[PDB]
């Protein structure tokens, strides 16, 4: 419109209306010129690429991308607490994106005639990098100004070399809207139907579903021998009931497992060797091994043991200001998934036992351990929990088949997720950057809780009494911090 006319206002708030929530977040960003306006091919060969597992080939692009994919973007710690204490489930409905108050600079003075190239890929023709849990997300704290991350992608390879089936994508070859300092951009995206995230912890366990007061009418084999001695064989059958629960016939069994190695938090308990990569469970694809992380959703540890965690089984966030390499465990924040302990196997334990032979007069009954177990009819399981720091959605890879598309790092899997938003400054050149404002608005449908539980629930609350810094607030230096990772599961349901 004009140099002196504003193209938008500052909208941040959250509206709680009936069965829905509407969250709105506005941030201030800065976009540098990347790659000196060039496409630059990248490979492991540039950085030296010593190993086969790490061998990659791809391209780096001058463009940036907006990433709002994490929850702390859209929810204040109070709104998160409001949401998790009162509700059994939630899910995104609508999306409203806006880009306004653009300012392009030259290197520093205002260059009023420049444009900004922005577009969204709504047909999903470009590689989708927003589901890999990268950085560049809008700051948790509204005051903070952030830098837009550089866009880039990978394609097929053999080692460092490319192949014929590889692809190349020109982000200039797309249609895009070119905005000046007076133009603004907006669009609205409607989420596809997805299940409500289950923000609750079961009040029953999968093996306790029985009535403790009654006997079953099914019988089991109690005794195979009358006593000690020769030729003592017998068949004795008893009733399954309150006195022996383990043997009762059950309608449902816990979910699948792929076992993890358990590392103790007390370092002296751990073996004196390097097992971080050698001992880690992994999956190989086309000859390259890859760590299984976080893996299938499984309880982090057995009850009563809080010091053990799966080797790559749970998400691990950083504390504010944590270094990149070889930080101590008190720097990282490891999440315990133990709320799914009711329906899911422990990640570090065998699923169960199976008979390995045919018993006979000579042969004893012999059983092995089941380290990994796939889906069986009659399994019921819980998905991994979502966190205030965690991802929201992921893109379902386009494929002939999949099972339970929910992404393994948590969140809402989508065939057509919120689209990518690409931005760069229009181009020897003038050294030039830009800044502006962004507002994202998501509608959230809520599932109310009608539990008839008599006693009070467990809630998320701030425990401390007197402390130097209130949690989830700035310090003396003005640095915002998130003290702990907060789960979504407090309220309970019957299994």
């Amino acid at each position, epitope marked *: 419109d004009g140099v002196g006319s504003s193209s938008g206002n500052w909208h941040c708030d959250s509206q709680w209306l009936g069965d829905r929530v509407i969250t709105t977040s506005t941030r201030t960003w800065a976009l540098p010129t990347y790659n000196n306006h060039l496409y630059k091919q990248i490979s492991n060969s540039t950085s030296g690429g010593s190993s086969n597992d790490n061998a990659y080939f791809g391209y780096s692009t001058p463009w940036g991308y907006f990433d709002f994919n994490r929850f702390h973007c859209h929810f204040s710690p109070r709104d998160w607490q409001r949401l998790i204490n009162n509700n059994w489930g939630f899910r995104p409905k609508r999306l409203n994106f806006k880009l306004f108050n653009i300012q392009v600079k030259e290197v520093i003075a205002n260059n009023l005639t420049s444009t900004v190239q922005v577009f969204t890929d709504s047909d999903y023709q470009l590689p989708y990098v927003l589901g890999s849990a990268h950085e560049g997300c809008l700051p948790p704290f509204p005051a903070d100004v952030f830098m837009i991350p550089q866009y880039g992608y990978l394609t097929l390879n053999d080692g460092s070399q490319a192949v014929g089936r590889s692809s190349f994508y020109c982000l200039e070859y797309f249609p895009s809207q070119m905005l000046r300092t007076g133009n603004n951009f907006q669009f609205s995206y409607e989420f596809e139907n997805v299940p409500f995230h289950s923000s609750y912890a079961h009040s029953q366990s999968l093996d306790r579903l029985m009535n403790p007061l009654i006997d079953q009418y099914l019988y089991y084999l109690s005794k195979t021998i009358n006593g000690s001695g020769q030729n003592q064989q017998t068949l004795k059958f008893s009733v399954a009931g309150p006195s022996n629960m383990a043997v009762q016939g059950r309608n449902y069994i816990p979910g699948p497992s792929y076992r993890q190695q358990r590392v103790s938090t007390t370092v002296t308990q751990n073996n004196n060797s390097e097992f971080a990569w050698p001992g880690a469970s992994s999956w190989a694809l086309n000859g390259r091994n890859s760590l299984m992380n976080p893996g299938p959703a499984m309880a982090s540890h057995k009850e009563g043991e*809080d010091r053990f965690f799966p080797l790559s089984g749970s998400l691990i966030f950083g504390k504010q200001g944590t270094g990149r390499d070889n930080v101590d465990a008190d720097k990282v924040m490891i999440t315990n998934e133990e709320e799914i302990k009711t329906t899911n196997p422990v990640a570090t334990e065998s699923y169960g036992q199976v008979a390995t032979n045919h018993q006979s007069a000579q042969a004893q009954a012999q059983t092995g351990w089941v380290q990994n177990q796939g889906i069986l009819p009659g399994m019921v399981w819980q998905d991994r929990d979502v966190y205030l720091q965690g991802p929201i959605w992921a893109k379902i890879p386009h494929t002939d088949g999949n099972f339970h598309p929910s992404p393994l790092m948590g969140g809402f899997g989508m065939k057509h997720p919120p689209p990518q938003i690409l931005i760069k400054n229009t181009p020897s050149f003038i050294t030039q950057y830009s800044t502006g404002q962004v507002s994202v608005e998501i509608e959230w449908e809520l599932q109310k809780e009608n539990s008839k539980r008599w006693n009070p629930e467990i809630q998320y609350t701030s425990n401390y009494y007197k402390s130097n810094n209130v949690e989830f607030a700035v310090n003396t230096e003005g640095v915002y911090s998130e003290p702990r990772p907060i789960g979504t599961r407090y309220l309970t349901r019957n299994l």
Partner: antibody
Amino acid sequence: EVQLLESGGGLVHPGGSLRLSCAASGFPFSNFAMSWVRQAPGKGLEWVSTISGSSGSTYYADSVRGRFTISRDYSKNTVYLEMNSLRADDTAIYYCAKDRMITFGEVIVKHYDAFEIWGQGTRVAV
Amino acid sequence: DIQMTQSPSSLSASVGDRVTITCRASQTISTNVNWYQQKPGKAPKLLIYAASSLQSGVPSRFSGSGSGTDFTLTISSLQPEDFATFYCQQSYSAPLTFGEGTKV
């Protein structure tokens, strides 16, 4: 489980200062009172200090009072027992004990009952 | 300040046969007394609280009794695991007080 790691260690010169820490894990930190019990070489074990779960009430032993100071950090789930102007008889191995009684803020009650879960302890030589 | 005095200072006994230790408090402290045991090189362990109540991990062969001034710690079926210095504690009022102890 319930786990208490105290290390202040130390060998200090009389009149010097020392700060014991006890890192508590596995229980609700705020709802239990934490205390320090002391045992000299070849002697009986002697109560030193205790602190309320909310840290509103700190109780010191008569010999200790005015010198040692007990406090708890809610961020690190750690209880501190800083001691200054130490004396010869302060030589002993100090223990960190969780209280049996669970409390909350909505009732005025004594915060000490019995020491349910102890800790291996550290040595203070002076 | 309240004083706990534990009457046997040291003791030795045959295994399996009953042993009893008592301590007498300086005032009526009702049911506040507690009992502990400490083996050499090991941290103490809580046995009895609120005069007679036994801790979840303590064997049923331990028991305790009394109110006001007098309290007794009775051990039936003494065992080799049971030989350690024993203490009684007041929970009644601060500053808290441990008895002198009894080496068994």
